[PDB]
Each structure stands twice: as structure tokens, then as C-alpha cells.
Structure 1
């Protein structure tokens, strides 16, 4: 249940589709000094090479083998990355796709990221190796063989998720091949895993696999360190399968978090920020100590999975920064920041027809991540984790770690604020008028640099300055026309 990050580092960043060499560099040049706890990487195992459409991001969720050979790099490059990141105290978490192999309709051949032969039709994946009796063909009871109804908890687990060949996870052989793959990664140095499509695996089968896993590599981690496990389970209610069914294996993705934060910030259906006072379990969310939270993820930022049209992404930059800011300031759950790539989003009848587009590439070869002088990224990588407003809130969370939620204020509409013990305070204005008021901050008297509009550099603030007096009060002014309609100050931004 614990992330295994360095003490004081409270967030992980999803460097979606990034190449291993770029992540290794990012660890040393940015993530380490900026205090990021770790990185969730795209599936490192060999996958189906899909040409129609042209190399979609989702081809990486169709395993061909467990060889660490993908568009992100080979095994040596993967190990190089894990080693370099761990050496600078930044962890690596692997997106483990262990529920299935490729789509059952993919043509047999060597159209895979490493040239491995596979025959979906004959259930043949010799590179593992898996064969017909390693899949759930006979176990599934639907007429299509695919998952047809989420109200039947059994077919959700035993049938094919959108045609993906479903592994017979009850077999010790299959459990062992998966464990062999994950233990290879653990021994290499990975700190944990995102268990892809966990809702599609029986809680008990996952547990059986986890019981085969090693403790983290003792060269970097304390003896007895268990790998961090966060299971992807989309539970927004209305279905028999609940997130809680997986608490015995590790943390679980709380999709209700970003879904509701999106509706609140967009002010849909009369919702407003003042309602966030009891944010957390009060909103029907899972226990904070089991939640892996985020505003958006690789799926719902592009209409895949769940979360709805309410989901906030980098496309909605201004509101997005505020959502990410609220999340990073609030004590609930363990935070994951999304880092994406720009794609030619094209809406037709309310839907993005280019939601399949893969990462920036030159004839299929993923482009490297170029760093600009202003610290942003080129080659179409959005690099949200590098936006000042997000990067400074990542440090905010670290600074206020362990402090209680306190000193909440709200105007009954969309102007709210709250503090984290005597270490940080944040103010939001999502109303269509100015927020100008003196608030109790719970902070020691002094001059504080607002870390949203600026930075504390060389003993001075580059943006807004807040003055806290002896009573802990300070005046805040946020126009609804402000570039970023929120201010955040903390112990380390104090002059």
C-alpha cells in the first residue's frame, strides 16, 4: 500500500509513451531536483505492432510476450533507466498488462515490437510461452465470448475485454509466467505496478500472483520492502463489482475523484467548489489510504474508459491547473500527475475521431522529448509536470506532508480556501467575480511567495506576494480574469 518513494516525495507522474532514455534523463535533470516521487511508465513488454490505424497508443495494451522490447526501448535501455532513476531517488512503476494478450482477431505473424511470432487465432504465443489452454475460451459463458454485460461480475472476469484474449489466471502456470515477468522487473529495480484491467481479474487471482512476488531490490530499498500495487478498477457505482473488493491486494484507482472534480470545477448540474469542504469519503470515495487519485488518466483524457465529458485535461489548461492544484493541496489519497502528448483532436458529433493517435513520431519512431529554454517541452509533448503551477504544487504537497486539513473557508459559491496545518494555505476563485478578502491562514507571520503566479528565487518572489500578520491572517485578491485564479503559499516559499 506504500509507494516506496523517498520520504518527503508524495507524487508520481505518468510519462505516457515516453522512451526509456528520455525518462532516465528526466529523472536526473528534473524529477529528482523538483521532488517527484516516481514515474509510471507505459507497458515495457513486447506488444502487437498495429498499422491500421497507424501505431495507436493502445497497441501497447495488447501483449505478445514479456520481453522488454517496445517503442520505448529495449531491455538494456529499460534497466539503464531504472538504475539511473533509482540512483537519484526517483522510482519507476510499471503498467503491468497481465489480464490478457492480444486481440483475438489480430493477424498471426511477427507484427510485434520485437519480431516475436504469435497466432491469436490458434491462441499461440510461443515467446512466453502460452497456448490454447492458457486462455478462458472454455470458461467464458457469453455467446460472443466477449464481455457483454457489466452487471454480471463473472463474465467481466472470465470473458474477453473488447476481444482481448483472456488469460486463465487461476492456473499456477499462468500465474507463474506473470510472476516471472514481474519479478524480473522488481529485481531490475522497479518499485511497484499499476495492474491494468484489474476489474477483469478475480481479486483472489491477483492475490495469488502477488504472493509470488519478491521484495524490492535490496541494493536500493530497505529489506522487506513490498512492491507498491495500485489496481485499475473503474467503479463509479451502478455495478456489482466494487473497488473495495480489491483492498486486500493494494491500492485502487479512484475514478470517482477526477469525475466529480471535473463536474465541480466546470460547475455542472449546479455543483460548486463550496461543496468540496467534505471532499473525500464524504463524497462516497474509497478510504484515503487505498486511493490512487488523479484528475485525468491516459484513457479518459481522450474519451476512453470512464469519467465522462466532465474530465479536465491539458486541453482545458486554466481549469486543469486549478483541479490539479486542489488535488495536490488536499490530503486525500496518493497523487498521480498526468504528462501527455498533443494529438490532432478532432470532434465530430461530440466525439474525437482521432482518439487513437499514438505519441509524436517520425514514421513510427517515437520522437525524443526536447527541452526548451523556458523549461517547457517541444516535439508535441505537453509536459504538464513541467508547468510552473503544477510543478510548484507537487512541491507544495511534499512541504505540507502529514499536516491536517484545516482553516476551510467558502463564500457559499465558488470562492474557497483551506490550509494544511501551519505549513501551507491555498485559495481558489471559480466564481465570475473578484475574490478579495482577509483569511485566517494558520501560517507563521511573514511574507510568502505565491507559487502559482511565480517562484521564490534568490530571496525574492517573482509573482504575487502574500503578507501574513501576527494573527495568521492575510489578504487575498483574485480577480476572475486572473491567468491562474488560485494562490498557494507554503513554508518553503516564505521569504
Structure 2
């Protein structure tokens, strides 16, 4: 559960937040496979509460009603078709499993669900599963409100309701079995792993009991004995009694300190600078690389709903975002997840975005299809960061240098740094307020390389900047602080 059952040579996954099943299946064939992406994290595929006030917010998908594969992304048949086609092209599917809870305790009873299933929060009745009052922690939680009130108390964080969400009694074999039933149905369909949502709100031992009931991946696509890849969402920035290390026995963990610190460093907040990235990784107090799932931003903190503060970089800050993603994809620490989102009307009032609830692009509630423009960009308000030349080429960069050591590091004591990955790739950054022009040792073999950030290598030629590596591995780099993309990356496959 620590290894990504991704195809050999593919090292990243992309989060196609709120994408429809039919759009993902197409993207797997027309883009993801050809460009070397290893997998796709999809939004919760199980039935959720249909919320009309606000109008269909993104977060309604984190309020389960049943485990029926029927949501705004599609039905069960469309979901299976997606997993099959993607798997047939070497692109894995990872499911966002919401298993810590059901929907809000205050939600009105009725059939306001994505598939018409009836449910009654007030009476803890979820017949479509089925679940009853006996399957929740109402009698176990010790707070006066019944909800989590203080994160300094490890017990209520697990036994009480996260912002009102009915908390499942995961200690009960019956509940563990209904969740396993749901997860095993997905595994048998072809899913390669799961993102365990709100893992901090579940005891490590309860998670383990559930994982012990899981099947091995589908033998039609994976080798015998393959275990599903598991990465648990645990926000641990320190200061709390719960540590992400407490979950190492179950699988990988999300390292939120990663995007938070990269954000402050690149923004140059409070005296930080890129030169300090020399010992990036465990040196910064992060969890072991082999237990880490890293990313710059996620669906939560890109809209200020998670943890990380205002330092988090997102597509809104394009120039710096591409640099942050590039550094991440070039550095060997952890398993990388690329974000892919949609645009919403950000409206800041007194320091906060009042429209942080806006759901995916839609027409009367029906999610809009992802349209592709002649320049490979997306329309219908889908950002498609994974399609940006700079990000896509760095995804390939990571594949090419997979396994190579971190070497030939250089820094000017400020914000101009560079490092290589064995003899397969080199990358340089200029985040200072002045130009960079120096000859550095790359460790690469002599030849002419195409800069994969400012261009591509097409039919024997580079469309952008060209780098010349001498016999001794030295190469000259010139990066103006006025350049669109203040960084250059070259690797074994961009050589003429």
C-alpha cells in the first residue's frame, strides 16, 4: 500500500477535480497516456447530498448518502467504462474514499440526493446502505456540541463530528464491512488505490481493520499480490497531539508542510529564499520520502479551505505556480500529485473569498464537458494545469530522471539555484530581482538540448531556448528576471 501500481516509467498522478467520468476516459486516451501520466485521482464516486443553497457547491460531494456509483460525474456504467479504458492505456484510477462520515446532521431528510436515494440525518437513517443510529458515534463523542471543538484532544477529533458530519462508528465490524464492501467493489472494477479522506478523524487501528478486508488488485490488469495504493489525508503542520507518523502502518500520508513551505519560500515571505532548499525534504522535518504524497496545492487549500494559509500557490498565481510545480517535479522527494482545476469567480472581502463554495462549470447544475482548444488548452472554464506546456513537460522530466540522484547543486546565497538529477537532467531557477548568467556544471553529456519550459523538441529542432553542453558537462545559462518563465530545464530526451 506504499507503492503506486503505476506503469513503469510513469511517476505522477493528476487530480481531475470534479471531472465527468466520460471526460476522464477520453483524457486518458488522448492525452494522459501519450504524455506519460501515471494516474488520476477522481472525485468521490458515491452518491452524495444534492445541496441547492448554496447552489451545488463542490463540497456537497463530501457528504455521502449511500455507496451507489451515481453522482454528477456519472453513473456506474460510465464509471466502469472510464476505469477500463484508462487501465487499457496504462493510466491508473485512484478513488477519493469518504469513509469517516455520512452527510451533515442538520441536512433535511428526503430524496435530495444525486441518485434519489432516501435518507434521514435526524434519525440516523440511511436505508440505501443501510446504516442506522447504531452505526454512529453519537453516544461515543464526549463534547457538549457533539462536534469537534478542540484539536488538542485526540479523542474527540476521532469520535466526534467534523463540522456536523455524522461520524461512523468505525470500530464496529458491521460498519467496517459495508465500507470494505464498497471499496472492494471499486477494486474489482479496476481501481488501483484510494485517497483516504479525513484520515486524521479515524483511529489508525480502525483504518487498518478495514484495509485488512480489501482484495488484491484486479488480476486482469495487475500482477498477482498487488495491493491497492493508499494515501491518507492527514493535515499535520505540527502543534497537535496527532502525528502523521501514527498512520505509517496503513500507507502513505499527504505532506501538507510541503506546499505550505514551498509557498513561503517562493513568495520570499519573512526572509526565506530558494537557497535554503538545498536540504529540502526530510531536512525540513517532513515525513520519510517513501511515505509521502506531495503537491503544491489541493482542492481544499487552493480556495483557502484547507491548511497552509495565504502562502499556498495556485493557478491564479501562474508565474510562481509553474516554478513551484517545476521544482517539485524535479526534486526526488515523495510521490507527486499535479493539480487540475476549474475557474470560479473569486470575490475577496475583508481578506476572504466569498465564493469559495462555487462548484464546477455547469448548466443548470449539469457539469459542463471539458472542451479542448486547437492549442491543447481547455475551454468551458476548466483550467487544465496538467496541459500547460511548462507543467506537462516537467511531468515527463520526472519520468526521464526517475531513479537518478540529487547532485550538482548551486545557489548564489539568494534566489538563484540549480541542481541536476544524475546525468539525465538539469534545472535552473532565477527568483531574484536581477538577471542570472553563469556557466554551471550539469553532469549531462555533450550536445545541444531543448529547454522544455520555453518550448519543445519537435522534429529535430527546439521551438524555444537551446542549451549547449560542453565535453566537461558545463553549459551557459541566461535567465532574465523579466522572462515569462524564470526557469530552464533540460533532460536526456530533449537533446538533439
Which whole-Å CA distance do the structure 1 matches of 2:81 and 2:334 have between them? Answer: 31
Deviation track 1:222-272 (CA, whole Å, cap 9, x = no partner) reads: 000000000000000000000000000000000000000000000001000
Tell me the equivalent position of 1:109: 110
Q: Which consecutive segments of 4 or more residues in structure 1 shift more than 3 A?
A: none
TM-score normalised by L of structure 1 = 1.00
Deviation track 1:420-472 (CA, whole Å, cap 9, x = no partner) reads: 00000000000000010000001000000000000000010000000000010
Deviation track 1:305-331 (CA, whole Å, cap 9, x = no partner) reads: 101100000000000000000000000
Q: Secondary structure at the match of 1:94?
A: strand
Which whole-Å CA distance do the structure 2 matches of 1:219 and 1:91 have between them? Answer: 13
Alpha-carbon offset, residue 3 of structure 1: 0.8
Which whole-Å CA distance do the structure 1 matches of 2:308 and 2:457 have between them? Answer: 36
Q: Secondary structure at the match of 1:428?
A: strand
Deviation track 1:159-216 (CA, whole Å, cap 9, x = no partner) reads: 0000000000000000000000000000000000000000000000000000000000
Residues 1:265 and 2:266 are matched in the alignment:
yes
Which whole-Å CA distance do the structure 2 matches of 1:256 and 1:336 have between them? Answer: 15
Which whole-Å CA distance do the structure 1 matches of 2:256 and 2:266 have between them? Answer: 16
Alpha-carbon offset, residue 474 of structure 1: 0.2
Alpha-carbon offset, residue 157 of structure 1: 0.2
Deviation track 1:62-94 (CA, whole Å, cap 9, x = no partner) reads: 000000000000000000000000000000000
Which whole-Å CA distance do the structure 2 matches of 1:266 and 1:287 have between them? Answer: 25
Which whole-Å CA distance do the structure 2 matches of 1:201 and 1:9 have between them? Answer: 31
Which whole-Å CA distance do the structure 2 matches of 1:103 and 1:471 have between them? Answer: 64
Which whole-Å CA distance do the structure 1 matches of 2:53 and 2:307 have between them? Answer: 24
- 1:318-397 matches, within 5 Å, as 318-397=319-398
TM-score normalised by L of structure 2 = 1.00
Deviation track 1:31-87 (CA, whole Å, cap 9, x = no partner) reads: 000000000000000000000000000000000000000000000000000000000
Alpha-carbon offset, residue 5 of structure 1: 0.1
Q: Secondary structure at the match of 2:468?
A: strand
Q: Secondary structure at the match of 1:394?
A: helix
Deviation track 1:389-410 (CA, whole Å, cap 9, x = no partner) reads: 0000000000000000000000
Alpha-carbon offset, residue 131 of structure 1: 0.2
Q: Secondary structure at the match of 1:426?
A: strand
Q: Secondary structure at the match of 2:310?
A: coil
Alpha-carbon offset, residue 121 of structure 1: 0.3
**RMSD, aligned CA:** 0.3
Q: Matched residue pairs, number?
A: 495
Q: Secondary structure at the match of 1:155?
A: helix
Alpha-carbon offset, residue 351 of structure 1: 0.2
Residues 1:214 and 2:220 are matched in the alignment:
no
Which whole-Å CA distance do the structure 1 matches of 2:216 and 2:442 have between them? Answer: 43
Which whole-Å CA distance do the structure 2 matches of 1:181 and 1:272 have between them? Answer: 46
Q: Secondary structure at the match of 1:296?
A: coil
Tell me the equivalent position of 1:467: 468
Q: Extract unaligned runs of 5+ from structure 1.
A: none
Alpha-carbon offset, residue 26 of structure 1: 0.1
Q: Secondary structure at the match of 1:161?
A: coil
